[PDB]
Every structure is written in C-alpha cells, then in structure tokens.
C-alpha cells in the first residue's frame, strides 16, 4: 500500500526525439526500454452481492488490475531484428497494428493491484492516490491458471491493453514515464494514444501518516514541473476520471 | 572541434562585424570629404555620390544579413553527456597502456 | 526575447537614418539662410547661441552614433554567445590480456 | 533488454577472472595393490 503522488501530460510524436534529449540533459541518465500487459477484472454480475451495506455504504465494488511483463520477442516483427533493442524502435510504433494479437494473449492466460479515487478537496497540488498491491508468484493444481484463479475469487475478465514506452530515473525516487497504449480485442488492435505519447511523472510514499515526507515529495514534483515550463505543461488530471468503481464507467486513457 | 554549422554561423557573424567596421570607416571618409566639399573645390564632387551610395548599401545589407541570422535563431530551436561514456574511454586507454607494458618489443 | 531584439534593432536602424538625415541637413544649411519671403523659417537671433546650438548638434550626433554602433556590436556578440552556449546536443582479447598479466605478475612476485 | 544494461553487465563480467576468489585443488593418487587405491583431494580457498 502506497500513496502515489502524480502529475500528468501528453506530447505529440513530432517533438518526441527532441524531448528525449532534453531529459538526458537534466537527469544525466539514458532512457531504458520497457513494456507491460495489464488485464482488468470486475466482479461477476451473475452473483448478487447483497453484502454491500446499502443503508451505510461501508464499501463499494471495485476493479482489479493484474499486470505482467512480456518479452520483446513477441513485439518485434520479422523486419526489426536488424535494429538494436533501444528506444529508437518507438519511432516505428505509430501504426494501430502490433505483432501481439488476441490469440497469443488468450494463450498467456503477475502483480495484483487495487486503487481508490484520489483525495477530495481543491487544496491539493498533485494527484494523491492510494494503492493496495500484492504479488502472485506461482500456483499448482488441476486448474492452475490466472483465469481460473480470478473466477475462484469471484471476478471475470473485462478488457486488456498493452503499454510500451521509456523510463527515466531521477533523484529522490522520482520516476518519469513516456507511454503508448494499445487496446487489444479479437476484432483487432487500436492505439488509443494515437499520434502522441502520454507523459506521467510520479513518486511513491510508503506510509501515508508521515507528512514531512509527503511535503518533500510535493516540493520535488512541483520543482520538476516548474523546470519544464514552456516545453510541456504538466497538470493534475480530473479527479472524476481516475475513478475505477464498477457502478460508474469511465477510463482515463 | 565544433560541428560545421556553428562554424559557418560564426564566420557569418564575423563578416557582420567586419562589415560594421567598414561602414564606420566609410562614414569617416565621407565626413572627411564633405569638409573640403564645403571648402570649395569641385574636383572631388563625383566621388561624393559613390561614397554615399556605397555607405548606404553597406548599412542596409549588413542589417539584412543580421536579420537573417536572428531569423535562423527562430527555426534553429528544436534542432554531463560525455561522462556517460567518459569512464569507458578511460578504461580503454588504461588497457592499451597495459598492452604496451605487456609487450616488451613495443617499448622503444 | 529574440523578437524584442528584432524590435530594438529596428529603432536602432531608424534612429541611425533619422540622425544621419538630421546631421546632413544641419551641416548643409549650417550656412545660415536669409530669405525675404515669409515662407522660409530660419532664425538666427542671438549671435553666439547659434554656435552653441551648432556644437549641440555636433555632440548629439557624435554620442548617438557611437552609442548605437557600440550597442549593435554588443548585440552581435550576445547572439554569438547564445549560439555557443544554449544549443543543447572485443571482450575475449581482454580476457587473455588479463590472464597473461596476472600470470606474469604471479611469476614475477 | 536495453542496450546500456547489457553493455555494463558484459563489461563488468569481463573482469570475473580477476575479481573472483582464487581457488586451487590438488588430487593425489597413491599407488596401492589389491585394487584398493585411496584418493587424497585437498582444495585450498581464501574466502
């Protein structure tokens, strides 16, 4: 469980290369390639959860995220082994098509994660969100599989998507991510972040009670934002967009 | 050494201030000639037109070229890093020295 | 920023042109003009204050020309400085090399 | 994955033969009859 303090933004791919150089001028570090695959699961509507205390609202149903890393050998087509595995490959990832299709992901079926809507009030300068996390290491039995496990808990699959981007590690534990997101269905693959990169700068705090640390984290994030003034505008997203409860449906992408 | 683009940029700038110096010098000669023109000898009268014309054409195109340079500044935007490899190159040379130490036939 | 420098050089050039025309007309009609017609407007009322106004013109044109040229030169150097500063930009053989080095030291130690 | 991490891993691993702990092993076989040959293996280490 962490308090994640975050700021968001977006950029057009035209400046992409330039942006990268500037980051290396500041951090002093080179970018590192990465990828991931997230699957979202929701409580089964076939089961009537009368246990939701309607007269008191002790709790509301929520959605579970399962993440995993996928090797690049599934994301590189027959035209791309010649180039080395570095960040420049992202320049060729502008098409809505991608080597990883629905059948391979179905064949695949980790990190389990749950979150809450950010803190209310208009006196917050950065998006503060609470995250509860655990890890699944292995399994066994006659039906050892992620799908069977989540159906045993009482959850069913809803959708999935694939993230590819680069990471920058700066001082004080600040992490800056440049991402491209591909939604995947049997109908096909569609790039929601079409013609651009999604930028997200964030820090993690282990204990929410410590307030000196939280103040330091906010100071670092606002200093970073004030450093990038004039190039990219980093902003607090909409509090109602980062809500992932089942009752109301929307997805920040 | 610097990349060539900066080299011709600095050459153009140097040409700019040399042209400015030439403009100042020509101002000096035109001020000189106007004195004797006021004195009353008409022999150097034809030279006056040439001096004035060259002075004005030196004043104009210099500013024009400087304007071009400042314009180049407009579109040139968007177009310790060495440390990231610095240790590496140091590493390389050290091993090279070891090679020179390792072979006694090359120490001459 | 750069647009401000553009504008500043603009008044720089127009001021050069205007002061040039002013000193030209002043020195050309420095010979005082007497015309009986009322249309002409040239007055020399107090004798020596005429020379005072003349040296006034001299000092003004000198100071303004020198200052403008020096300002332009400093501007050019500033541009060049901005140009310079602001523009942000086998293993196996080593294995036997170290093996020979270590065995040589072991023998020689 | 990324080129930089693999490059650094390769360059660091290149120095294993120097940085690693030295070891030695000596096997002594004593000639004995009656097909009964004892062995004496002594390994020397500097942990």
Swiss-Prot record, chain A:
Recorded superkingdom: Eukaryota
Intracellular or extracellular location(s): Nucleus
Keywords: Activator, Nucleus, Transcription, Transcription regulation
One Gene Ontology molecular-function label: transcription coregulator activity
Statement: the UniProt record of this protein carries the keyword Translocase: no
A GO biological-process term: RNA polymerase II preinitiation complex assembly
InterPro entries: Mediator_Med18
GO cellular component, as recorded: core mediator complex; mediator complex; nucleus
Note: Present with 1011 molecules/cell in log phase SD medium.
Function, as annotated: Component of the Mediator complex, a coactivator involved in the regulated transcription of nearly all RNA polymerase II-dependent genes. Mediator functions as a bridge to convey information from gene-specific regulatory proteins to the basal RNA polymerase II transcription machinery. The Mediator complex, having a compact conformation in its free form, is recruited to promoters by direct interactions with regulatory proteins and serves for the assembly of a functional preinitiation complex with RNA polymerase II and the general transcription factors.
Family named by the database record: Belongs to the Mediator complex subunit 18 family.
Protein name: Mediator of RNA polymerase II transcription subunit 18
Organism of provenance: Saccharomyces cerevisiae (strain ATCC 204508 / S288c) (Baker's yeast)
UniProtKB/Swiss-Prot annotation, chain B:
Keywords attached to this entry: Activator, Coiled coil, Nucleus, Transcription, Transcription regulation
Effect of residue 31 to A: Impairs interaction with RAD3, reducing the interaction of TFIIH with the head module and consequently resulting in a reduction of RNA polymerase II CTD 'Ser-5' phosphorylation
Coiled-coil regions listed: 56-100
Localization per record: Nucleus
GO molecular function: TFIIH-class transcription factor complex binding; transcription coactivator activity
GO biological process, any: positive regulation of transcription by RNA polymerase II
A GO term from the CC aspect: core mediator complex
Additional observations: Present with 396 molecules/cell in log phase SD medium.
Function per UniProt: Component of the Mediator complex, a coactivator involved in the regulated transcription of nearly all RNA polymerase II-dependent genes. Mediator functions as a bridge to convey information from gene-specific regulatory proteins to the basal RNA polymerase II transcription machinery. The Mediator complex, having a compact conformation in its free form, is recruited to promoters by direct interactions with regulatory proteins and serves for the assembly of a functional pre-initiation complex (PIC) with RNA polymerase II and the general transcription factors.
Family: Belongs to the mediator complex subunit 11 family.
Name of the molecule in the record: Mediator of RNA polymerase II transcription subunit 11
Organism annotation: Saccharomyces cerevisiae (strain ATCC 204508 / S288c)
From Swiss-Prot, chain C:
Primary location recorded for the protein, binned into one broad class: nucleus
Protein localization: Nucleus
Residue list for modification N-acetylserine: 2
A GO cellular component annotation in the UniProt record: nucleus
Short name of one Pfam family: Med22
Alphabetized Gene3D superfamilies for the sequence: Mediator of RNA polymerase II transcription subunit 22
GO molecular function, one term: transcription coregulator activity
Record key words, sorted: Acetylation, Activator, Nucleus, Transcription, Transcription regulation
GO biological process terms on file: positive regulation of transcription by RNA polymerase II; positive regulation of transcription elongation by RNA polymerase II; positive regulation of transcription initiation by RNA polymerase II; RNA polymerase II preinitiation complex assembly
Miscellaneous: Present with 2181 molecules/cell in log phase SD medium.
Complex formation: Component of the Mediator complex, which is composed of at least 21 subunits that form three structurally distinct submodules. The Mediator head module contains MED6, MED8, MED11, SRB4/MED17, SRB5/MED18, ROX3/MED19, SRB2/MED20 and SRB6/MED22, the middle module contains MED1, MED4, NUT1/MED5, MED7, CSE2/MED9, NUT2/MED10, SRB7/MED21 and SOH1/MED31, and the tail module contains MED2, PGD1/MED3, RGR1/MED14, GAL11/MED15 and SIN4/MED16. The head and the middle modules interact directly with RNA polymerase II, whereas the elongated tail module interacts with gene-specific regulatory proteins.
Membership in a protein family: Belongs to the Mediator complex subunit 22 family.
This protein's name: Mediator of RNA polymerase II transcription subunit 22
Organism: Saccharomyces cerevisiae (strain ATCC 204508 / S288c)
UniProtKB/Swiss-Prot annotation, chain D:
Compartments reported by the entry: Nucleus
Highest taxon in the source lineage: Eukaryota
Function: Component of the Mediator complex, a coactivator involved in the regulated transcription of nearly all RNA polymerase II-dependent genes. Mediator functions as a bridge to convey information from gene-specific regulatory proteins to the basal RNA polymerase II transcription machinery. The Mediator complex, having a compact conformation in its free form, is recruited to promoters by direct interactions with regulatory proteins and serves for the assembly of a functional preinitiation complex with RNA polymerase II and the general transcription factors.
Remarks, miscellaneous: Present with 1720 molecules/cell in log phase SD medium.
Subunit relationships: Component of the Mediator complex, which is composed of at least 21 subunits that form three structurally distinct submodules. The Mediator head module contains MED6, MED8, MED11, SRB4/MED17, SRB5/MED18, ROX3/MED19, SRB2/MED20 and SRB6/MED22, the middle module contains MED1, MED4, NUT1/MED5, MED7, CSE2/MED9, NUT2/MED10, SRB7/MED21 and SOH1/MED31, and the tail module contains MED2, PGD1/MED3, RGR1/MED14, GAL11/MED15 and SIN4/MED16. The head and the middle modules interact directly with RNA polymerase II, whereas the elongated tail module interacts with gene-specific regulatory proteins.
């Amino acid at each position: 469980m962490v308090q994640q303090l975050s700021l968001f933004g977006s950029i057009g791919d035209d400046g992409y290369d330039l942006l990268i150089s500037t980051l290396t001028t500041i951090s002093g570090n080179p970018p590192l390639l990465y990828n991931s695959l997230c699957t979202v699961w929701k409580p089964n509507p076939s089961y009537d959860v009368e246990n939701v205390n309607s007269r008191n609202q002790l709790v509301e149903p929520n959605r579970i995220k399962l993440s995993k890393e996928v090797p690049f050998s599934y994301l590189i087509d027959e035209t791309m082994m010649d180039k080395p595995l570095n960040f420049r490959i992202l320049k060729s990832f502008t098409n809505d098509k991608i080597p990883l299709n629905y059948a391979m992901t179905r064949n695949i079926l980790w990190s389990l994660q749950i979150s809450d809507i950010p803190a209310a009030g208009n006196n917050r300068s950065v998006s503060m969100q609470t995250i509860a996390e655990t890890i699944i290491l292995s399994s066994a039995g006659k039906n050892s599989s992620v799908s069977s496990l989540m159906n045993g808990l009482g959850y069913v699959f809803e959708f999935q998507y694939l993230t590819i981007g680069v990471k920058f590690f700066m001082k004080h534990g600040l992490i800056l991510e440049l991402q491209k997101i591909w939604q995947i269905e049997e109908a096909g693959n569609s790039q929601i972040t079409s013609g651009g990169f999604l930028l997200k700068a964030y820090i993690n705090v282990s204990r929410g009670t410590d307030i000196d640390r939280i103040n330091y984290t906010e100071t670092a994030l606002m200093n970073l934002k004030k450093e990038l003034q004039g190039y990219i505008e980093l902003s607090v997203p909409d509090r109602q967009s980062m809500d992932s409860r089942v009752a109301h449906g929307n997805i920040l992408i | 050494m610097q990349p060539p683009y900066i080299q011709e940029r600095l050459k153009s700038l140097n040409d700019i201030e040399t042209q400015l110096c030439s403009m100042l010098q020509e101002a000096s000669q035109v001020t000189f000639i106007f004195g004797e023109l006021k004195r009353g000898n008409e022999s150097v009268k034809p030279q006056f037109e040439n001096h004035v014309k060259q002075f004005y054409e030196r004043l104009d195109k210099s500013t024009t070229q400087l304007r071009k340079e400042i314009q180049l500044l407009d579109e040139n935007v968007g177009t310790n890093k060495k440390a990231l490899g610095q240790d590496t190159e140091k590493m390389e040379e050290q091993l090279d020295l070891l090679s020179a130490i390792l072979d006694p036939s090359k120490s001459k | 920023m750069s647009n401000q420098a553009l504008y500043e050089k603009l008044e720089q050039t127009r001021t050069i042109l205007s002061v040039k025309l002013a000193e030209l007309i002043n020195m050309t009609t420095i010979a005082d003009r007497n015309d009986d017609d009322e249309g002409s407007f040239a007055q020399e009322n107090s004798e020596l204050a005429v020379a005072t106004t003349s040296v006034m013109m001299v000092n003004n044109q000198t100071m303004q020309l020198i200052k403008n040229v020096q300002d332009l030169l400093i501007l050019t150097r500033s541009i060049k400085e901005k140009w310079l500063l602001n523009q942000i930009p086998d293993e196996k053989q080593i294995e036997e090399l170290l093996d020979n080095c270590i065995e040589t030291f072991v023998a020689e130690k | 994955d990324d080129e930089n991490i693999t490059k650094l891993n390769k360059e660091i691993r290149a120095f294993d033969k120097l940085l690693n702990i030295p070891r030695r092993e000596l096997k002594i076989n004593l000639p004995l009859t009656e097909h009964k040959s004892p062995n004496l293996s002594l390994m020397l280490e500097s942990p």
